From Swiss-Prot:
Keywords: Acetylation, Cytoplasm, Differentiation, Disulfide bond, IgE-binding protein, Immunity, Innate immunity, Lectin, mRNA processing, mRNA splicing, Nucleus, Phosphoprotein, Repeat, Secreted, Spliceosome. One of its GO terms (molecular function) is protein phosphatase binding. This is Galectin-3. The gene is LGALS3. The chain holds residues 113 to 250 of 250 of the full protein. It is found in: Cytoplasm; Nucleus; Secreted.
């Protein structure tokens, strides 16, 4: 598999109709996964499945500006399974990131970082075997 943490450059930043596809397998006894869409040191979109927060499974989404985390957005619909293969699809739309897991819509995350062309890398980390990380224009 690919080395984790993995940096996927996004040349010239994100743009509407850009589709990012991550394929991997969750480790057995996973604690977390993280996708970090970055604008320099800022994190425009942090997508963070948590397998055991107070014995609950939750996805936390947030933005980091000037080294400070913002207001969390929490999704209790939790499509990831310890030990099992997954597909994350992130479609950039004009006003949000649109996330599907295993071909099922999961959540939208409204753009807080407005300079889309400056969000020029994606960090992939946490308790996975990473199979592939790629992008295409639809
Ligand atoms: O918000 C994303 C960010 O969360 C940090 O953890 C938070 C935690 O979610 C919150 O419940 C607590 O009150 O504050 C913690 C510290 O900000 C994680 O440390 C970080 O990695 C992100 O995932
Ligand atoms: Cl914020
Ligand atoms: Cl901005
Ligand atoms: Cl690619």
């Amino acid at each position: 598999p690919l080395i984790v943490p993995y940096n996927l450059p996004l040349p010239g930043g994100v743009v509407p109709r850009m589709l990012i596809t991550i394929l991997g397998t969750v480790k057995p006894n996973a604690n977390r996964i993280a996708l970090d869409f970055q604008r320099g040191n800022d994190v425009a979109f942090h997508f963070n499945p948590r397998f055991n927060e107070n014995n609950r499974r939750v996805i936390v989404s947030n933005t980091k500006l000037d080294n400070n985390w913002g207001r969390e957005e929490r999704q209790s619909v939790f499509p990831f399974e310890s030990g099992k293969p997954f597909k994350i699809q992130v479609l950039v739309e004009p006003d949000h990131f649109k996330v599907a897991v295993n071909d099922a819509h999961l959540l939208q995350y409204n753009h807080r970082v407005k300079k889309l062309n400056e969000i020029s890398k994606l960090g992939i980390s946490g308790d996975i075997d990473l199979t592939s990380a790629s992008y295409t224009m639809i």
